[PDB]
Design a protein around this ligand. Structure first.
Ligand SMILES: *[C@@H]1O[C@H](CO)[C@@H](O[C@@H]2O[C@H](CO)[C@@H](O[C@@H]3O[C@H](CO)[C@@H](O)[C@H](O)[C@@H]3O)[C@H](O)[C@H]2NC(C)=O)[C@H](O)[C@H]1NC(C)=O
Ligand SMILES: *[C@@H]1O[C@H](CO)[C@@H](O[C@@H]2O[C@H](CO)[C@@H](O[C@@H]3O[C@H](CO)[C@@H](O)[C@H](O)[C@@H]3O)[C@H](O)[C@H]2NC(C)=O)[C@H](O)[C@H]1NC(C)=O
Ligand SMILES: *[C@@H]1O[C@H](CO)[C@@H](O[C@@H]2O[C@H](CO)[C@@H](O[C@@H]3O[C@H](CO)[C@@H](O)[C@H](O)[C@@H]3O)[C@H](O)[C@H]2NC(C)=O)[C@H](O)[C@H]1NC(C)=O
Ligand SMILES: CC(=O)N[C@H]1[C@H]([C@H](O)[C@H](O)CO)O[C@@](O)(C(=O)O)C[C@@H]1O
Ligand SMILES: CC(=O)N[C@H]1[C@H]([C@H](O)[C@H](O)CO)O[C@@](O)(C(=O)O)C[C@@H]1O
Ligand SMILES: CC(=O)N[C@H]1[C@H]([C@H](O)[C@H](O)CO)O[C@@](O)(C(=O)O)C[C@@H]1O
Ligand SMILES: *[C@@H]1O[C@H](CO)[C@@H](O)[C@H](O)[C@H]1NC(C)=O
Ligand SMILES: *[C@@H]1O[C@H](CO)[C@@H](O)[C@H](O)[C@H]1NC(C)=O
Ligand SMILES: *[C@@H]1O[C@H](CO)[C@@H](O)[C@H](O)[C@H]1NC(C)=O
Ligand SMILES: *[C@@H]1O[C@H](CO)[C@@H](O)[C@H](O)[C@H]1NC(C)=O
Ligand SMILES: *[C@@H]1O[C@H](CO)[C@@H](O)[C@H](O)[C@H]1NC(C)=O
Ligand SMILES: *[C@@H]1O[C@H](CO)[C@@H](O)[C@H](O)[C@H]1NC(C)=O
Ligand SMILES: *[C@@H]1O[C@H](CO)[C@@H](O)[C@H](O)[C@H]1NC(C)=O
Ligand SMILES: *[C@@H]1O[C@H](CO)[C@@H](O)[C@H](O)[C@H]1NC(C)=O
Ligand SMILES: *[C@@H]1O[C@H](CO)[C@@H](O)[C@H](O)[C@H]1NC(C)=O
Ligand SMILES: *[C@@H]1O[C@H](CO)[C@@H](O)[C@H](O)[C@H]1NC(C)=O
Ligand SMILES: *[C@@H]1O[C@H](CO)[C@@H](O)[C@H](O)[C@H]1NC(C)=O
Ligand SMILES: *[C@@H]1O[C@H](CO)[C@@H](O)[C@H](O)[C@H]1NC(C)=O
Lengths: 328, 175, 328, 175, 328, 175
């Protein structure tokens, strides 16, 4: 095309790719240590060590267990009508009120903890023919004897205890959770002294269910001067239903109902300090950043968190093979 | 690497190429010099970002789950609670491990592909005027000054312009 | 080879691939919207809205619950000795017979529902010294009072309720499921009136097990005029074993046994209409076609169904990249 | 695409090729015209059907399972029932999503492979008689009428038949 | 360089790959039978049929069930204070001692089986005012009547079964598991004869819990001449806690405690013979080699085993495509 | 295969090559001969061993789990125990099946890659002195005795040594 050139020479072009002096090792299908130019870590492996108090409502239980907050141990009256997204239960929580036990504590703690509210409505129960407001010197309301704020201990008026037979409709729009209980005396003399009859009986029923618990007289170990226990029970009454509480003795009566909610609330045991900062993923070790897809901090989590994995490191290559000419 | 360019016919990388991932060096009619190719460097980068964004997306929120730490010995129901979570953890661990392996494997082939594609592309452009020396370098059989090198690199190289010159001293069977 | 020619010219061949004007978007490892020539949908996402009555045996419960069909609420006598692959329980099911409760209703409904049969064999139980066939005006057999068809309410004869002690061997080839119960009176006067003793007791035993239930006297809420309940219990008696029913009061006796089967039967709550058509996958929303590997109609399913997934669409590219002649 | 043909050196697709997935277009001394290649079109199709059949196979029947909808608040055991199913659903959703992604990625490379294989095959057939103009077209350096084009397309092209003609006016260094 | 050669000739080089005459079929993403040069089987599908007694401690239960070994059925006194990694329960296990039942047998067998030890410490319980060491002619200690070695059947002194009220602290470093029980008489005359009162009562409590069981008088089926049963219960007492056993009748007292451990122990039902050989994976079908990643022998496993899969064969191609020229 | 060499341009395999996976046959001035290539044979083998070792590693020990066989009909809790295990088994079965499929697919492309890489490598070495006859054989256009064949095979072939000879009788347009 162009005219015969008076010169003659060639040129050389070489293609190639960069390489870095340092370079990270990564796993592959066929090798488990191959060095690439660059990688990114896919496993979150460390907590800040603090539960960020934002954006979830974190209620610190301080030295109360959620069940004591519910029953209303004097030292937990702080929590009345409280609300949470995550209730944090501290290892140092204690109780000091009448010795109780909750047969299936596990489910009561669960269903209270998901409801997320401790909102109490007092109802006009009328106990005809018994003495109300009994308390104990093991559960002190300040100077005096006392009891759980939400429970009502009924004993003999004058020298009898009648067959209590009360009712409380759920004419409301929502489910109502009633917590009640039965007192187990330690001696037969204690049984008759308080409730007159030799054997109490509590039957709590709705149209849908019934439960009859009979007390058990006997000595248990000394807890706060007492050898007696009360066992805790719960009844949910659906809208339109009726609660009928019938007893001839040993009843620990409900003073009304807790409202049930359906939300995203939970409870978590942790001694991690709550701090002001915003983090959506909470583990009992404190909050962790959900930038990475997987995490290895803890298998217990609340909120938008990375998926727990056994691996503490998983590198994703974000660059080609590193084939250096020199080294550094 | 499936394509055999990186760690293959291109013996090693250039620690010196600090301005791109793939590129050109040339010995020429007014000095030796290097220059990174930005189009294949972006191609490699965007694919890697794409997969990276897909794996970095979608954290599932979970709120009230089952209890995962017990402090009393219960038997059958607690045995089941521990089994559900342990099998969940092992299945997700298998998934994270196979995912990064599968992925890493693919990233090495993808970046290797881009190398070989730049090569093949440069090959086609040079048509009959260059021979592959098989080490990732082409011998250009005609006088190719710096602007000529710039046009091969920016894809405007007209091969006809040098076909006769090249072709002649390429096949001068006289030695 | 051939001879020198007079004409001289070249030709051009170009390779290429088709492209479509329309084209579907699809996800990849590296991009999440890449356009291909063609895709196919892998998530089944819609029901016909009808439970196809073929090929599975679908028994529509109409307004009976499976447990009422079992106990034999008068309004469900239709179901006696019925059989199913899938029992469909309707939201509108009701019961109108003596108020009962089944402690662990959940397991009784399960094990009846998997057995798949309600085949009843009446056995010659002989209740010596008590009145049989008691019924209630809350459970009407037509004009009169009545009871569950499969249960036998025993009351005193004149002045006495004896300690019942009967036995019924399983000399048969199969397991026998016996449903029995205990009556809880609402008043003490009711207890003594019916069963003479102040406290009934029912112990049902085999060589392998025993259960003793004691009744609970008290007022429950009014259900069909009654403040009493009966609680339902079940005993499976293995081949070669013996059933011994012993009671001194409040027994609701079994009239024989249900046969147990081992099959592929289940129960499903659904208000979807049953219709004549053939579909192997059933969800409570109606049947769905199992051509696709995954589905998003419902997580509850019976039969050969696609796997439930959260995703409501997952497109599998079934063609190459679409690179059209002109993007706009 | 790993091979760089589709959306690569073959700039775009032909909306006009309604009779196959891959094919040929030619301009020669007699006219122009197009024709689809049925062998690579089947190769692409059968692989896509193969994977499609494997993913569309094996529905597992399940009959009596666990209850998955509750209407009363029970606590611990119901908590576990909901956890077992929720973790089951999340694990299967992960599987369906990774499966179609992995698959789709592979289908694009597989159809891309077939493109590049047809090209390389046509390249080898033409031996010294054609040059790649690098846009997916070959310049055939000899008089190639419609039957010649039919023989390249049906794989019977004898390159020797035109080697001298081609070779001469291919390397006629005279301009 | 060199000088002109008179001869003018070419050469031919051909590249290729080996092929084998035989060749295995394998599955792929796009085909499910493609023939490769070589494959390796990834599913372990057969047992040796023998439980290798190494390296795990395998205790063969011979004709004892772990619960009978625990309670101490005479025919199982062999197992006292034994220890295991895997306890093997044989189909032929039987029991011949007083008829008992364990409400939630399932959890007792589990928690004993993971503890891995049957180490018994006798404690100095002092039963004041009752007769100790009662036995039965259905549970023979050699020639004579006897009972479970670890249980103590108490009956009255003279005309008095006092209210037993004993205590036993856990001043130790570890949790203690106490097994106790209650006797259910078959006749009222039997109740009063043995325990004097008309109704026994057993309450076993710690600071953390209580359980009160009341017996149930009635006829059960004849098992070894007896119509009575004893029901078994377990109480774990944490370190620092106290056990208080209180009863006025029907107590089957603990003779001390079992030590609890935390290890890798389990129990497995299998009739596979134990043999001397070393294998880390055990299934009830015998041991299997854990060289392969997956297995199809049994879903029940103990130790380092392959993952159970439904597939009985899964071939991993370990070679290229086989494209033969002859055929074979 | 993505690259189209095995079961592709290399028509079939050699049952006779008992000493390697890939190799050379030739027919030169002193007769015919075959010889396996050990470098690509190791490359293919080591990758296959690598993946094989990764899949053959890590058995998880499990000790006390949940009971998986029942002999009495219990209802709700037993229903859950059977569901947890059945869903566990189906998830792991899906994993084993997708794993060997994914793998097998990749092993066929990996061994195919090595074939094509050996080819391309031999191609580049021969520079202008050979033509591909497109069936996996190169026609070497100059006198190449057994030592010449040995040097192509051991990568020391100097193409310049025969460039003039080859080039001349390659392009002798005279027939
Ligand atoms: C049944 O037996 C139990 C245990 O043998 C008896 O319980 C013990 O009762 C005594 C007297 O009340 C308790 O004593 C008090 O203990 C506190 C704390 O150490 C101390 O400060 C007091 O000054 C007094 O000593 C003792 O703690 C308690 N022990 C346990 C383990 O609970 C119970 O009295 C017996 N019941 C009957 C009716 O016989
Ligand atoms: C214990 O308390 C409960 C609730 O306070 C009492 O239940 C109520 O009993 C009355 C009288 O039987 C029931 O009245 C009846 O209502 C139906 C429908 O209106 C009607 O057919 C009858 O003529 C009569 O009016 C009432 O429904 C029932 N309420 C509930 C919520 O169950 C029970 O009587 C008390 N028991 C004792 C022994 O005091
Ligand atoms: C309540 O009813 C049950 C069953 O009807 C009665 O049980 C039966 O009692 C008899 C007499 O003890 C048992 O007979 C014995 O059989 C063995 C074995 O053959 C034999 O060696 C003894 O000498 C004796 O004859 C019979 O086995 C037993 N049957 C069952 C199924 O347990 C029970 O006696 C009744 N109880 C009362 C207080 O009426
Ligand atoms: C309702 C009632 O009478 N409560 C009394 C109780 C009960 O007798 C015991 O708690 C039974 O265990 O005993 C006290 O000594 C106590 O310290 O609590 C005083 C208290 O007034
Ligand atoms: C066996 C028996 O005597 N049944 C009678 C019952 C019971 O007394 C109550 O159901 C106890 O709650 O009461 C009736 O009024 C009823 O309407 O059912 C009449 C019936 O004959
Ligand atoms: C403590 C005691 O008195 N045990 C006696 C028992 C019980 O009376 C029954 O087991 C109650 O069911 O009866 C025997 O006949 C027996 O064979 O075991 C003799 C034995 O000495
Ligand atoms: C709790 O909230 C309810 C809301 O209606 C209120 O009536 C009640 O008195 C509150 N009690 C306390 C202690 O805040
Ligand atoms: C998180 O806390 C657990 C115990 O709650 C501990 O075992 C674990 O190692 C901690 N992990 C990190 C990363 O802090
Ligand atoms: C490594 O990759 C990550 C993610 O692509 C990126 O943020 C990081 O900067 C990369 N490293 C370098 C040196 O670019
Ligand atoms: C390519 O480089 C040549 C030489 O510098 C220049 O003339 C030409 O315009 C360039 N083209 C582009 C698109 O950069
Ligand atoms: C139910 O089936 C059995 C089968 O033997 C029969 O004896 C019984 O009488 C049947 N009863 C009814 C109501 O169909
Ligand atoms: C199926 O029914 C459920 C409730 O049973 C409903 O929430 C869901 O959206 C329905 N899905 C379809 C596709 O009908
Ligand atoms: C898209 O793919 C599916 C499955 O391969 C097929 O049935 C459908 O017809 C394809 N679309 C077209 C236009 O061919
Ligand atoms: C290929 O095309 C040519 C020209 O039409 C024809 O002669 C030849 O027979 C064809 N071969 C085949 C196999 O179709
Ligand atoms: C069981 O072991 C303990 C260990 O202290 C010992 O005191 C006890 O006597 C042993 N009993 C038997 C029967 O071996
Ligand atoms: C293992 O034993 C089970 C029953 O325990 C049996 O069904 C299964 O087929 C056996 N498998 C092998 C490989 O022995
Ligand atoms: C097949 O592959 C396995 C694992 O790589 C190997 O042990 C076996 O020897 C191979 N077969 C042959 C014939 O080499
Ligand atoms: C290659 O082969 C030639 C001919 O036998 C020999 O001279 C040369 O040294 C060989 N080189 C190597 C590295 O084997």
């Amino acid at each position: 095309q162009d005219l015969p050139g008076n010169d003659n020479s060639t040129a050389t072009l070489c293609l190639g790719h960069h390489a870095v002096p340092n370079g990270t090792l990564v796993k592959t299908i066929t090798d488990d240590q191959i060095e690439v130019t660059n990688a990114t870590e896919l496993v979150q492996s460390s907590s800040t060590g603090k539960i960020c108090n934002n954006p979830h409502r974190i209620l610190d239980g301080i030295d109360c267990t959620l069940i004591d907050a519910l029953l209303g141990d004097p030292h937990c009256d702080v929590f009345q009508n409280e609300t949470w997204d995550l209730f944090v239960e501290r290892s140092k929580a204690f109780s000091n009120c009448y010795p109780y036990d909750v047969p299936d504590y596990a489910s009561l703690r669960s269903l209270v903890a998901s409801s997320g509210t401790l909102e109490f409505i007092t109802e006009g129960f009328t106990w005809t023919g018994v003495t109300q407001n009994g308390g104990s010197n093991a559960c002190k309301r300040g100077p005096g004897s006392g009891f759980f704020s939400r429970l009502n201990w009924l004993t003999k008026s004058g020298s009898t205890y009648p067959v209590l037979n009360v009712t409380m409709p759920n004419n409301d729009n929502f489910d109502k959770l009633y917590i009640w209980g039965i007192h187990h005396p330690s001696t037969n003399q204690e049984q008759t002294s308080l409730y007159v009859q030799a054997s109490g009986r509590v039957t709590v029923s709705t149209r849908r269910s019934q439960q009859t618990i009979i007390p058990n007289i006997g000595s248990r170990p000394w807890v706060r001067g007492l050898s007696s226990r009360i066992s805790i029970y719960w009844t949910i009454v659906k809208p339109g239903d009726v609660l009928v509480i019938n007893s001839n003795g040993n009843l620990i009566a409900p003073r009304g109902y807790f409202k049930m909610r359906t939300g995203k609330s939970s409870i978590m045991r942790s001694d991690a300090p709550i701090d002001t900062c915003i983090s959506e993923c909470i583990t009992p070790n404190g909050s962790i950043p959900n930038d990475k897809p997987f995490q290895n901090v803890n298998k217990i989590t609340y909120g938008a968190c990375p998926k727990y994995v056994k691996q503490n490191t998983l590198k994703l290559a974000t660059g080609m093979r590193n084939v250096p000419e020199k080294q550094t | 690497g499936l394509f055999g360019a990186i760690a293959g016919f291109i013996e090693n990388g250039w620690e010196g190429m600090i301005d791109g991932w793939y590129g050109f060096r040339h010995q020429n009619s007014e000095g030796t010099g290097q220059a990174a190719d930005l189009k294949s460097t972006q191609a490699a980068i965007d694919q890697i970002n794409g997969k990276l964004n897909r794996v970095i997306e979608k954290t599932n929120e979970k709120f009230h789950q089952i209890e995962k730490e017990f402090s009393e010995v219960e038997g059958r129901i607690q045995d089941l609670e521990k089994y559900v979570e342990d099998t969940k953890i092992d299945l997700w661990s298998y998934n994270a491990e196979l995912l990064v392996a599968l992925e890493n494997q693919h990233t090495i082939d993808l970046t290797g592909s881009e190398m070989n594609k730049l090569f093949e592309k440069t090959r086609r452009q040079l048509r009959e005027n260059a021979e592959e020396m098989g080490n990732g370098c082409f011998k250009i059989y005609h006088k190719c000054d710096n602007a000529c090198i710039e046009s091969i690199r920016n894809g405007t190289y007209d091969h006809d312009v040098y076909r006769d010159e090249a072709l002649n001293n390429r096949f001068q069977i006289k030695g």
